[PDB]
Protein backbone atom coordinates (compact mmCIF):
# COMPACT_ATOMS: atom_id res chain seq x y z
CA UNK A 1 0.00 0.00 0.00
CA UNK A 2 2.93 2.30 0.75
CA UNK A 3 5.43 3.76 -1.70
CA UNK A 4 8.85 2.09 -1.58
CA UNK A 5 11.35 4.38 0.20
CA UNK A 6 13.67 4.88 -2.77
CA UNK A 7 14.30 8.52 -1.83
CA UNK A 8 15.67 7.36 1.52
CA UNK A 9 18.51 5.40 -0.14
CA UNK A 10 19.24 7.51 -3.23
CA UNK A 11 19.17 10.90 -1.46
CA UNK A 12 20.42 9.87 1.97
CA UNK A 13 22.76 12.60 3.18
CA UNK A 14 25.68 10.27 3.99
CA UNK A 15 26.98 7.24 2.08
CA UNK A 16 29.20 4.40 3.34
CA UNK A 17 32.58 3.29 2.04
CA UNK A 18 32.82 0.49 -0.51
CA UNK A 19 34.57 -2.00 1.78
CA UNK A 20 31.74 -1.54 4.30
CA UNK A 21 28.87 -1.22 1.81
CA UNK A 22 25.40 -1.14 3.35
CA UNK A 23 22.28 -3.03 2.24
CA UNK A 24 18.66 -1.99 2.78
CA UNK A 25 15.81 -4.47 2.33
CA UNK A 26 12.86 -3.04 0.38
CA UNK A 27 9.64 -4.92 1.10
CA UNK A 28 5.86 -4.60 1.44
CA UNK A 29 5.48 -1.51 -0.73
CA UNK A 30 4.71 -0.28 -4.25
CA UNK A 31 7.72 0.62 -6.41
CA UNK A 32 7.18 3.24 -9.12
CA UNK A 33 10.60 2.86 -10.75
CA UNK A 34 9.98 5.93 -12.92
CA UNK A 35 11.25 7.99 -9.98
CA UNK A 36 14.68 6.65 -10.99
CA UNK A 37 14.70 6.56 -14.80
CA UNK A 38 13.08 10.00 -15.02
CA UNK A 39 16.14 11.45 -13.28
CA UNK A 40 18.82 13.11 -15.40
CA UNK A 41 21.94 12.91 -13.20
CA UNK A 42 22.45 9.12 -13.29
CA UNK A 43 25.80 8.64 -15.04
CA UNK A 44 25.33 4.86 -15.27
CA UNK A 45 21.87 3.24 -15.41
CA UNK A 46 22.36 -0.34 -16.59
CA UNK A 47 20.45 -3.47 -15.65
CA UNK A 48 21.23 -7.18 -15.89
CA UNK A 49 18.65 -9.86 -16.62
CA UNK A 50 15.86 -7.25 -16.80
CA UNK A 51 15.06 -4.03 -18.68
CA UNK A 52 14.60 -0.87 -16.63
CA UNK A 53 11.71 0.39 -18.78
CA UNK A 54 9.73 -2.77 -17.92
CA UNK A 55 10.39 -2.57 -14.17
CA UNK A 56 6.99 -0.95 -13.50
CA UNK A 57 5.30 -4.05 -15.00
CA UNK A 58 7.03 -6.58 -12.73
CA UNK A 59 6.59 -7.99 -9.23
CA UNK A 60 9.38 -9.30 -7.00
CA UNK A 61 9.56 -11.09 -3.68
CA UNK A 62 11.99 -8.50 -2.30
CA UNK A 63 14.24 -5.67 -3.47
CA UNK A 64 17.70 -5.03 -2.04
CA UNK A 65 19.65 -1.78 -2.37
CA UNK A 66 23.39 -1.51 -1.72
CA UNK A 67 25.06 1.88 -1.28
CA UNK A 68 28.71 2.98 -1.46
CA UNK A 69 31.02 5.55 -3.05
CA UNK A 70 33.76 4.78 -5.57
CA UNK A 71 35.77 7.15 -7.69
CA UNK A 72 34.77 7.58 -11.32
CA UNK A 73 37.34 5.16 -12.75
CA UNK A 74 36.06 2.44 -10.36
CA UNK A 75 32.39 2.46 -11.41
CA UNK A 76 33.29 0.02 -14.21
CA UNK A 77 34.13 -2.59 -11.55
CA UNK A 78 30.51 -2.69 -10.29
CA UNK A 79 29.51 -5.34 -12.83
CA UNK A 80 29.07 -9.13 -12.80
CA UNK A 81 32.30 -11.08 -13.19
CA UNK A 82 34.51 -7.99 -13.22
CA UNK A 83 38.08 -7.99 -11.92
CA UNK A 84 40.01 -5.35 -10.02
CA UNK A 85 40.64 -4.28 -6.46
CA UNK A 86 37.04 -3.17 -5.89
CA UNK A 87 35.35 -6.18 -7.49
CA UNK A 88 37.66 -8.66 -5.72
CA UNK A 89 38.33 -7.16 -2.28
CA UNK A 90 35.28 -4.92 -1.71
CA UNK A 91 32.02 -5.47 -3.63
CA UNK A 92 31.45 -8.40 -6.00
CA UNK A 93 28.36 -9.26 -8.05
CA UNK A 94 27.52 -12.82 -9.14
CA UNK A 95 27.55 -13.59 -12.84
CA UNK A 96 23.82 -14.41 -12.82
CA UNK A 97 23.10 -11.08 -11.09
CA UNK A 98 19.61 -9.77 -11.82
CA UNK A 99 19.31 -6.09 -11.01
CA UNK A 100 20.52 -2.62 -11.92
CA UNK A 101 23.65 -0.58 -11.22
CA UNK A 102 23.12 3.14 -10.67
CA UNK A 103 25.84 5.76 -10.28
CA UNK A 104 25.95 9.55 -10.41
CA UNK A 105 28.71 12.12 -9.96
CA UNK A 106 28.85 13.76 -6.53
CA UNK A 107 31.62 16.37 -6.50
CA UNK A 108 29.59 19.20 -4.93
CA UNK A 109 29.18 16.85 -1.99
CA UNK A 110 31.88 14.38 -0.90
CA UNK A 111 34.62 16.44 -2.62
CA UNK A 112 36.54 19.33 -1.08
CA UNK A 113 39.25 21.78 -2.10
CA UNK A 114 41.11 20.54 0.99
CA UNK A 115 40.46 16.98 -0.17
CA UNK A 116 37.99 14.51 1.32
CA UNK A 117 39.89 11.39 2.42
CA UNK A 118 37.11 9.81 4.50
CA UNK A 119 36.07 7.22 1.89
CA UNK A 120 38.14 4.03 2.10
CA UNK A 121 38.62 0.89 0.04
CA UNK A 122 40.43 -2.36 0.77
CA UNK A 123 43.41 -3.14 -1.47
CA UNK A 124 44.96 -6.15 0.32
CA UNK A 125 43.30 -9.44 1.24
CA UNK A 126 43.96 -13.18 1.28
CA UNK A 127 41.58 -14.38 -1.40
CA UNK A 128 38.79 -12.81 -3.41
CA UNK A 129 35.39 -12.02 -1.94
CA UNK A 130 32.42 -14.21 -2.68
CA UNK A 131 29.41 -12.56 -4.37
CA UNK A 132 27.69 -10.20 -1.91
CA UNK A 133 30.26 -10.97 0.80
CA UNK A 134 31.40 -8.19 3.14
CA UNK A 135 34.78 -7.70 4.84
CA UNK A 136 34.82 -4.93 7.46
CA UNK A 137 37.94 -6.03 9.35
CA UNK A 138 40.95 -3.73 9.73
CA UNK A 139 43.78 -6.11 10.67
CA UNK A 140 47.38 -5.40 9.54
CA UNK A 141 48.16 -7.33 6.37
CA UNK A 142 51.21 -9.49 5.68
CA UNK A 143 51.89 -11.34 2.41
CA UNK A 144 53.35 -14.05 4.66
CA UNK A 145 49.89 -14.55 6.17
CA UNK A 146 51.10 -14.44 9.78
CA UNK A 147 50.17 -11.68 12.25
CA UNK A 148 52.25 -8.51 12.04
CA UNK A 149 52.07 -5.01 13.45
CA UNK A 150 52.36 -1.95 11.18
CA UNK A 151 55.87 -0.52 11.74
CA UNK A 152 57.54 -3.78 10.66
CA UNK A 153 58.46 -4.43 7.03
CA UNK A 154 56.15 -6.51 4.80
CA UNK A 155 53.28 -5.31 7.01
CA UNK A 156 50.58 -3.03 5.60
CA UNK A 157 47.25 -1.62 6.67
CA UNK A 158 44.78 -3.17 4.20
CA UNK A 159 42.55 -0.08 3.82
CA UNK A 160 43.48 2.75 1.45
CA UNK A 161 41.69 6.09 1.23
CA UNK A 162 40.22 7.89 -1.75
CA UNK A 163 41.41 11.37 -2.65
CA UNK A 164 38.35 13.42 -3.63
CA UNK A 165 39.42 16.94 -4.62
CA UNK A 166 37.32 19.58 -6.37
CA UNK A 167 40.06 20.12 -8.99
CA UNK A 168 40.54 16.63 -10.46
CA UNK A 169 39.06 15.12 -13.59
CA UNK A 170 35.83 13.15 -13.48
CA UNK A 171 37.80 9.90 -13.25
CA UNK A 172 38.91 10.88 -9.73
CA UNK A 173 35.76 12.70 -8.60
CA UNK A 174 33.52 10.67 -6.27
CA UNK A 175 30.44 8.80 -7.46
CA UNK A 176 27.61 7.48 -5.32
CA UNK A 177 26.51 3.99 -6.37
CA UNK A 178 23.25 2.15 -5.72
CA UNK A 179 22.96 -1.52 -6.72
CA UNK A 180 19.38 -2.80 -6.88
CA UNK A 181 18.83 -6.55 -6.53
CA UNK A 182 15.48 -8.11 -7.49
CA UNK A 183 14.69 -11.34 -5.63
CA UNK A 184 12.34 -14.09 -6.88
CA UNK A 185 11.70 -16.69 -4.17
CA UNK A 186 8.79 -19.12 -3.88
CA UNK A 187 6.98 -16.66 -1.63
CA UNK A 188 4.36 -13.91 -2.00
CA UNK A 189 5.43 -10.81 -3.91
CA UNK A 190 5.91 -7.81 -1.62
CA UNK A 191 7.27 -5.23 -4.12
CA UNK A 192 5.18 -4.62 -7.25
CA UNK A 193 4.65 -1.93 -9.86
CA UNK A 194 2.65 1.27 -9.48
CA UNK A 195 -0.82 0.25 -10.68
CA UNK B 1 37.48 -12.47 -16.09
CA UNK B 2 34.97 -12.92 -18.90
CA UNK B 3 36.69 -13.99 -22.13
CA UNK B 4 34.87 -12.99 -25.31
CA UNK B 5 36.07 -14.88 -28.40
CA UNK B 6 34.82 -14.11 -31.90
CA UNK B 7 34.39 -16.52 -34.81
CA UNK B 8 33.50 -16.52 -38.49
CA UNK B 9 35.78 -13.85 -39.93
CA UNK B 10 37.28 -14.10 -43.37
CA UNK B 11 37.21 -12.78 -46.91
CA UNK B 12 34.24 -12.40 -49.26
CA UNK B 13 33.52 -10.48 -52.44
CA UNK B 14 31.48 -7.28 -52.44
CA UNK B 15 27.77 -7.96 -52.16
CA UNK B 16 28.33 -11.34 -50.52
CA UNK B 17 27.34 -12.40 -47.02
CA UNK B 18 29.20 -13.46 -43.89
CA UNK B 19 28.19 -14.36 -40.34
CA UNK B 20 30.12 -13.74 -37.13
CA UNK B 21 29.65 -15.31 -33.70
CA UNK B 22 30.89 -14.71 -30.17
CA UNK B 23 30.66 -16.48 -26.81
CA UNK B 24 32.36 -16.94 -23.43
CA UNK B 25 33.69 -20.09 -21.71
CA UNK B 26 31.15 -21.14 -19.10
CA UNK B 27 30.32 -17.50 -18.40
CA UNK B 28 26.56 -17.15 -18.85
CA UNK B 29 25.92 -14.06 -20.97
CA UNK B 30 22.16 -14.56 -20.62
CA UNK B 31 21.77 -11.44 -18.45
CA UNK B 32 24.35 -9.42 -20.41
CA UNK B 33 23.61 -7.18 -23.36
CA UNK B 34 25.79 -8.16 -26.32
CA UNK B 35 27.00 -6.18 -29.30
CA UNK B 36 29.64 -5.57 -31.94
CA UNK B 37 32.22 -2.87 -32.62
CA UNK B 38 34.36 -2.14 -35.66
CA UNK B 39 37.93 -0.88 -36.22
CA UNK B 40 38.25 0.39 -39.81
CA UNK B 41 41.89 0.79 -40.94
CA UNK B 42 43.01 4.33 -40.21
CA UNK B 43 39.94 5.14 -38.09
CA UNK B 44 39.12 4.41 -34.46
CA UNK B 45 36.75 1.77 -33.12
CA UNK B 46 33.09 2.51 -33.85
CA UNK B 47 29.71 1.04 -32.94
CA UNK B 48 27.95 -1.53 -35.13
CA UNK B 49 25.09 -3.26 -33.34
CA UNK B 50 23.76 -4.31 -29.95
CA UNK B 51 21.03 -6.58 -28.58
CA UNK B 52 19.48 -6.71 -25.12
CA UNK B 53 19.71 -9.79 -22.91
CA UNK B 54 16.25 -11.05 -23.94
CA UNK B 55 16.34 -9.55 -27.48
CA UNK B 56 13.41 -7.21 -26.73
CA UNK B 57 15.46 -4.39 -28.29
CA UNK B 58 18.26 -4.18 -30.86
CA UNK B 59 20.26 -1.25 -32.20
CA UNK B 60 22.32 -0.51 -35.31
CA UNK B 61 24.48 2.33 -36.53
CA UNK B 62 23.15 4.22 -39.54
CA UNK B 63 26.10 3.15 -41.71
CA UNK B 64 24.94 -0.42 -41.12
CA UNK B 65 21.12 -0.46 -40.68
CA UNK B 66 19.27 -2.83 -43.00
CA UNK B 67 22.33 -4.78 -44.14
CA UNK B 68 23.48 -6.23 -40.80
CA UNK B 69 21.20 -8.01 -38.34
CA UNK B 70 22.24 -8.97 -34.81
CA UNK B 71 20.70 -11.91 -32.95
CA UNK B 72 21.42 -14.16 -29.99
CA UNK B 73 20.76 -17.70 -28.77
CA UNK B 74 21.00 -17.79 -24.98
CA UNK B 75 20.79 -21.59 -25.07
CA UNK B 76 24.11 -21.56 -26.95
CA UNK B 77 25.50 -18.51 -25.08
CA UNK B 78 26.22 -16.92 -28.46
CA UNK B 79 25.55 -13.65 -30.28
CA UNK B 80 25.55 -13.49 -34.08
CA UNK B 81 26.11 -10.68 -36.59
CA UNK B 82 24.58 -11.56 -39.96
CA UNK B 83 26.16 -9.21 -42.52
CA UNK B 84 24.64 -9.01 -46.00
CA UNK B 85 25.44 -6.85 -49.04
CA UNK B 86 28.98 -6.18 -47.86
CA UNK B 87 30.77 -3.10 -49.28
CA UNK B 88 34.57 -2.44 -49.31
CA UNK B 89 33.94 0.11 -46.54
CA UNK B 90 33.04 -2.79 -44.21
CA UNK B 91 36.62 -4.13 -44.24
CA UNK B 92 37.73 -4.00 -40.60
CA UNK B 93 38.44 -6.09 -37.52
CA UNK B 94 35.18 -6.73 -35.68
CA UNK B 95 35.09 -6.82 -31.88
CA UNK B 96 32.53 -8.47 -29.60
CA UNK B 97 31.31 -6.73 -26.44
CA UNK B 98 29.23 -7.61 -23.38
CA UNK B 99 27.72 -5.31 -20.80
CA UNK B 100 24.66 -4.14 -18.95
CA UNK B 101 21.30 -3.27 -20.48
CA UNK B 102 21.53 0.51 -20.28
CA UNK B 103 18.26 2.36 -19.83
CA UNK B 104 19.55 4.99 -22.26
CA UNK B 105 21.41 4.48 -25.58
CA UNK B 106 24.82 4.37 -23.91
CA UNK B 107 25.28 1.12 -25.86
CA UNK B 108 25.62 3.31 -28.95
CA UNK B 109 29.37 3.99 -29.21
CA UNK B 110 30.83 4.74 -25.71
CA UNK B 111 32.81 1.50 -25.69
CA UNK B 112 33.71 2.05 -22.03
CA UNK B 113 30.04 1.61 -21.08
CA UNK B 114 30.45 -2.04 -22.06
CA UNK B 115 32.25 -4.06 -19.41
CA UNK B 116 34.01 -6.58 -21.68
CA UNK B 117 35.61 -6.72 -25.12
CA UNK B 118 36.79 -9.59 -27.29
CA UNK B 119 40.09 -9.85 -29.13
CA UNK B 120 38.76 -9.20 -32.63
CA UNK B 121 38.44 -10.99 -35.97
CA UNK B 122 39.28 -9.59 -39.40
CA UNK B 123 36.75 -9.25 -42.22
CA UNK B 124 37.90 -8.14 -45.68
CA UNK B 125 35.71 -7.57 -48.73
CA UNK B 126 36.99 -6.79 -52.22
Amino acid sequence: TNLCPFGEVFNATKFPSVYAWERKKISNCVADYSVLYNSTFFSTFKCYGVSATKLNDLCFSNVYADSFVVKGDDVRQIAPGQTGVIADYNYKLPDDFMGCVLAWNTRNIDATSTGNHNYKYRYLRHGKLRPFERDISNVPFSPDGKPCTPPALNCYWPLNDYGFYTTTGIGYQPYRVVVLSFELLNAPATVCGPK
Amino acid sequence: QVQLVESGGGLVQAGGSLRLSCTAPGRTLKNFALGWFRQIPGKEREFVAAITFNADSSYYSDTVKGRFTISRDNAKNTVYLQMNSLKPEDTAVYYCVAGGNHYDSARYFSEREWDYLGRGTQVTVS
Epitope: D57, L58, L184, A189, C192, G193, K195 | -
Partner: nanobody, 129 residues
Framework: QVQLVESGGDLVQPGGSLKLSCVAS????????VGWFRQAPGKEREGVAC????????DIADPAKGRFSIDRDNAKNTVYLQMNILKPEDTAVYFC????????????????????????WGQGTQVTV
Protein backbone atom coordinates in the same frame (compact mmCIF):
# COMPACT_ATOMS: atom_id res chain seq x y z
CA GLN C 1 3.34 -24.96 -10.58
CA VAL C 2 0.48 -22.46 -10.65
CA GLN C 3 -3.11 -23.69 -10.92
CA LEU C 4 -5.95 -21.42 -12.06
CA VAL C 5 -9.67 -21.52 -11.24
CA GLU C 6 -12.26 -19.24 -12.83
CA SER C 7 -15.50 -18.25 -11.12
CA GLY C 8 -18.35 -15.76 -11.25
CA GLY C 9 -19.80 -16.98 -14.53
CA ASP C 10 -23.59 -16.94 -14.59
CA LEU C 11 -26.60 -16.28 -16.80
CA VAL C 12 -27.40 -12.59 -17.27
CA GLN C 13 -29.69 -10.68 -19.59
CA PRO C 14 -28.61 -8.28 -22.36
CA GLY C 15 -27.19 -5.10 -20.88
CA GLY C 16 -26.15 -6.96 -17.73
CA SER C 17 -22.91 -6.74 -15.78
CA LEU C 18 -20.83 -9.73 -14.67
CA LYS C 19 -17.52 -9.81 -12.79
CA LEU C 20 -15.31 -12.84 -13.43
CA SER C 21 -12.63 -13.91 -10.95
CA CYS C 22 -9.40 -15.81 -11.66
CA VAL C 23 -7.96 -17.03 -8.35
CA ALA C 24 -4.67 -18.95 -8.54
CA SER C 25 -4.34 -22.00 -6.32
CA UNK C 26 -0.85 -23.29 -5.47
CA UNK C 27 1.66 -20.97 -7.10
CA UNK C 28 1.37 -17.24 -6.50
CA UNK C 29 -0.16 -15.26 -9.36
CA UNK C 30 1.86 -12.07 -8.75
CA UNK C 31 4.74 -13.40 -10.90
CA UNK C 32 2.61 -14.02 -14.01
CA UNK C 33 1.13 -12.00 -16.83
CA VAL C 34 -2.56 -12.95 -16.91
CA GLY C 35 -4.95 -12.90 -19.85
CA TRP C 36 -8.68 -13.46 -20.21
CA PHE C 37 -9.90 -15.60 -23.12
CA ARG C 38 -13.29 -16.84 -24.32
CA GLN C 39 -14.38 -19.80 -26.45
CA ALA C 40 -17.79 -20.49 -27.97
CA PRO C 41 -19.39 -22.99 -30.37
CA GLY C 42 -18.51 -22.05 -33.92
CA LYS C 43 -16.00 -19.57 -32.47
CA GLU C 44 -12.25 -20.04 -32.26
CA ARG C 45 -10.84 -19.04 -28.87
CA GLU C 46 -10.15 -15.30 -28.87
CA GLY C 47 -8.36 -12.93 -26.53
CA VAL C 48 -10.47 -10.54 -24.47
CA ALA C 49 -8.14 -8.84 -21.96
CA CYS C 50 -4.66 -9.12 -20.50
CA UNK C 51 -2.75 -7.50 -17.65
CA UNK C 52 0.91 -7.23 -16.76
CA UNK C 53 2.18 -8.79 -13.54
CA UNK C 54 1.57 -5.54 -11.64
CA UNK C 55 -1.36 -4.14 -13.63
CA UNK C 56 0.78 -1.28 -14.95
CA UNK C 57 0.05 -2.29 -18.57
CA UNK C 58 -3.32 -3.67 -19.69
CA ASP C 59 -5.11 -4.26 -22.99
CA ILE C 60 -8.67 -4.94 -24.16
CA ALA C 61 -9.63 -6.66 -27.41
CA ASP C 62 -11.54 -4.74 -30.07
CA PRO C 63 -14.95 -6.47 -29.63
CA ALA C 64 -14.74 -5.78 -25.87
CA LYS C 65 -13.40 -2.20 -25.89
CA GLY C 66 -15.39 0.26 -23.80
CA ARG C 67 -17.33 -2.55 -22.10
CA PHE C 68 -14.74 -4.91 -20.57
CA SER C 69 -12.08 -3.96 -18.02
CA ILE C 70 -9.32 -5.95 -16.32
CA ASP C 71 -7.98 -5.57 -12.78
CA ARG C 72 -6.00 -7.68 -10.32
CA ASP C 73 -5.31 -8.06 -6.60
CA ASN C 74 -1.91 -9.69 -6.10
CA ALA C 75 -2.42 -9.85 -2.33
CA LYS C 76 -5.54 -11.95 -3.03
CA ASN C 77 -3.91 -14.01 -5.83
CA THR C 78 -6.75 -12.94 -8.13
CA VAL C 79 -7.30 -11.31 -11.52
CA TYR C 80 -10.73 -9.80 -12.24
CA LEU C 81 -12.58 -9.23 -15.51
CA GLN C 82 -15.43 -6.71 -15.40
CA MET C 83 -17.93 -6.99 -18.27
CA ASN C 84 -20.61 -4.33 -18.79
CA ILE C 85 -23.44 -3.89 -21.35
CA LEU C 86 -23.14 -7.58 -22.21
CA LYS C 87 -24.44 -8.60 -25.64
CA PRO C 88 -25.80 -12.02 -26.66
CA GLU C 89 -22.70 -12.38 -28.85
CA ASP C 90 -20.63 -12.33 -25.63
CA THR C 91 -22.06 -15.74 -24.64
CA ALA C 92 -19.03 -17.99 -24.14
CA VAL C 93 -16.96 -19.86 -21.58
CA TYR C 94 -14.25 -17.54 -20.28
CA PHE C 95 -10.81 -18.79 -19.27
CA CYS C 96 -7.94 -17.07 -17.53
CA UNK C 97 -4.37 -17.98 -18.41
CA UNK C 98 -0.97 -17.10 -16.96
CA UNK C 99 2.57 -16.81 -18.31
CA UNK C 100 5.75 -16.17 -16.33
CA UNK C 101 6.52 -12.45 -16.29
CA UNK C 102 10.13 -12.89 -17.45
CA UNK C 103 8.84 -14.72 -20.54
CA UNK C 104 6.08 -12.16 -21.13
CA UNK C 105 8.34 -9.09 -21.05
CA UNK C 106 10.32 -10.56 -23.96
CA UNK C 107 7.47 -9.38 -26.21
CA UNK C 108 6.82 -5.72 -26.94
CA UNK C 109 3.60 -3.87 -26.18
CA UNK C 110 1.19 -4.49 -23.31
CA UNK C 111 0.92 -8.15 -22.23
CA UNK C 112 -0.02 -10.47 -25.10
CA UNK C 113 -3.70 -11.44 -25.49
CA UNK C 114 -2.71 -14.24 -27.90
CA UNK C 115 -3.99 -17.82 -27.38
CA UNK C 116 -0.69 -19.47 -28.37
CA UNK C 117 1.01 -17.51 -25.60
CA UNK C 118 -0.16 -18.14 -22.02
CA UNK C 119 0.28 -21.91 -21.65
CA UNK C 120 -1.07 -22.45 -18.12
CA TRP C 121 -4.86 -22.43 -18.32
CA GLY C 122 -7.87 -22.67 -16.09
CA GLN C 123 -10.90 -24.73 -17.03
CA GLY C 124 -13.25 -21.78 -17.52
CA THR C 125 -16.60 -20.51 -16.32
CA GLN C 126 -19.81 -20.21 -18.34
CA VAL C 127 -21.27 -16.82 -19.30
CA THR C 128 -24.71 -16.79 -20.94
CA VAL C 129 -26.31 -13.53 -22.06
Amino acid sequence: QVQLVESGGDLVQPGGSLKLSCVASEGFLAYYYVGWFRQAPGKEREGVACTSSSGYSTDIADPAKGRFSIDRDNAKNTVYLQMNILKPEDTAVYFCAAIDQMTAVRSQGPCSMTPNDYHDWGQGTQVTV
